[PDB]
A paper describes a structure:
Our preliminary experiments with gold ions using Cys mutants (161 C/165 C and 168 C/169 C) demonstrate the potential of the 4-fold channel of apo-ferritin as a site for constructing Au clustering. Another important insight is that the side chain of cysteine is relatively short, making the interaction between Au atoms bound on different monomers rather difficult. In addition, the binding mode presents less diversity with a common pattern of one cysteine binding to two Au atoms acting as a bridge. Therefore, to create an Au clustering site at the 4-fold channel, coordination residues with longer side chain and larger rotamer space are needed to build the interaction between Au atoms from different monomers.
Author numbering:
A (entry chain A), B (entry chain A), C (entry chain A), D (entry chain A): 1 to 172
Write the structure that this text describes.
């Protein structure tokens, strides 16, 4: 019943709905990661807050995709949201590894949707991914890689803790 | 691995996890209702915004339950989130009916959790439901009932539209 | 006599001049639509103002294309501007239909210019259309589709008028 | 000589006086814990300040119970206050363990007073415990559990210190 649809393939429409699922699944993973770190026997509030903010960001990405689906005259379709892959998330290092794997999977999904958009000659879709997704994901993955290295440094050794503290207490 | 748990039954712990599922399912229903009203062939932005706000409120209720689960030393466990019951939501009247049915089901779930809390002599749980849930649900259901009556009045007849307009344009 | 031209095909240069014509023709259509709604026997000032603003937006798009033509070292060439397709525009519904047809034709022209830019390996042109045209057109076409649905709802029936008024007077 | 007493059992009146004793005993324990940490050979001022604030909070709880005793027309009766269980409090971990044991004992006393209030059909008493005691105790016990885990993490190992520092210096 759309009167607006133009140059918007059914292939991209379906891929957008799948990507909304993937972003909401990611948001739900981050909600689980955050509340795990809020447990009294884990009790790292900053890590809870880090993942709570990422749950928000992933929800917001899904909402942006849904708004765009309607802007193009496609039909938002929702599927079941699978529960996160784990119920307990181990150490901060374990959790940050799981997060980077998750973000890499979203980034690959964005790249696959660009490939589809390019094959379907859909420049509005490409511009949309560029405006709101591709560089956001690269920045977040770089931050997570930085965090993995610093966690690895801090937990690994005296030299590494000392080097971290110098950066923080003398330079910053 | 909790060192804090006191007077918190495994029955309530499990019921709280189920209620988190129900609230997140409700939030996901409201996300679908809102984006339906944002379709170009439906195009009632105020109804989209009404349900978008309720998606937020239901998410927030789930997050409050999860925070409380950790405060009591229970273990948050997440399950799959089923997709909403419909993909298209009909008219504003259809949608507001579906919303009141949904809110009634959450209210009954809250009342069942009070019954369990009372049976388990858990006054902190009871106080928690009173502080953040029971009156919030009654207020929202009353608002929805008011909206059902006004939608029914507006769509039904000339007399009803005229009466609505008098309230709005002469009295308010 | 340009000393700046680089990677700018004669094909794109010509297509840009044609697109300036199409945008100025659109602006002139909107000027006619707006003054039609200002007639004393039509007298819908809000519809006049809506189309007056679109006349401005289409002029501004043409001016942006002309600035870009000079930035690239092409030569702006102007042709005659044909008068709008009608002298009287019927009802608000008739007019909004004509507007969406017009905007669709501009959007297809933008997509055709992207195809040409891609074939000519001209990424500055592609970036220019993305920055200032493609999403602007999709947003405007979605707004127009929303308006068509609401006009259709309002003129069509009691149920539809009532539903519109609920959104506006109770929710907004 | 009360002219106001209504629905206030002698059982609850006595239990309230006992609970005032328990809260003042707790306040006195916290005063001893705080000044222990202020010793020059212990010298952890933040731990002194943490327990000094809890001494204040426990005094304030006792004063609230006494105000309520008079509001209901019962008679405040004071007994001797026993000295705290230890004269020296060991390490921060030892002290935080002793504190959580203390708070658990107050929480159980509050739950026992709810049981008595419910048996005596005294809803004002129940509302009073809900308003000012039950959730305050759960929040404080959760904070103490968080602190036990972080102390245990910090004192236990290199990995644990590193993880703590990451939360604090990189995330917070
Ligand atoms: Au969290
Ligand atoms: Au947090
Ligand atoms: Au692309
Ligand atoms: Au593309
Ligand atoms: Au630092
Ligand atoms: Au530092
Ligand atoms: Au520092
Ligand atoms: Au919405
Ligand atoms: Au909305
Ligand atoms: Au209850
Ligand atoms: Au209860
Ligand atoms: Au009104
Ligand atoms: Au009104
Ligand atoms: Au009015
Ligand atoms: Au006008
Ligand atoms: Au006007
Ligand atoms: Au292009
Ligand atoms: Au290009
Ligand atoms: Au309105
Ligand atoms: Au209105
Ligand atoms: Au109104
Ligand atoms: Au002190
Ligand atoms: Au102190
Ligand atoms: Au009670
Ligand atoms: Au009671
Ligand atoms: Au810190
Ligand atoms: Au720190
Ligand atoms: Au720091
Ligand atoms: Cl969280
Ligand atoms: Cl299903
Ligand atoms: Cl493309
Ligand atoms: Cl929404
Ligand atoms: Cl499963
Ligand atoms: Cl109870
Ligand atoms: Cl005009
Ligand atoms: Cl000529
Ligand atoms: Cl290109
Ligand atoms: Cl002190
Ligand atoms: Cl004595
Ligand atoms: Cl009672």
């Amino acid at each position: 019943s759309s009167q607006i649809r133009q140059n918007y393939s059914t292939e991209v429409e379906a891929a957008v709905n799948r990507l909304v699922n993937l972003y909401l699944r990611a948001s739900y993973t981050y909600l689980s990661l955050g509340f795990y770190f809020d447990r009294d026997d884990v009790a790292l509030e900053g890590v809870c807050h880090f993942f709570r903010e990422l749950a928000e960001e992933k929800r917001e990405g899904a909402e942006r995709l849904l708004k765009m689906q309607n802007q193009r005259g496609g039909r938002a379709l929702f599927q079941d949201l699978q529960k996160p892959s784990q119920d307990e998330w181990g150490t901060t290092l374990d959790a940050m590894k799981a997060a980077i794997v998750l973000e890499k999977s979203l980034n690959q999904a964005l790249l696959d949707l660009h490939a589809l958009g390019s094959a379907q000659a859909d420049p509005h879709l490409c511009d949309f991914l560029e405006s709101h997704f591709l560089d956001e994901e690269v920045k977040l993955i770089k931050k997570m890689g930085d965090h993995l290295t610093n966690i690895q440094r801090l937990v690994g050794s005296q030299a590494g803790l000392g080097e971290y503290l110098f950066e923080c207490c003398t330079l910053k």
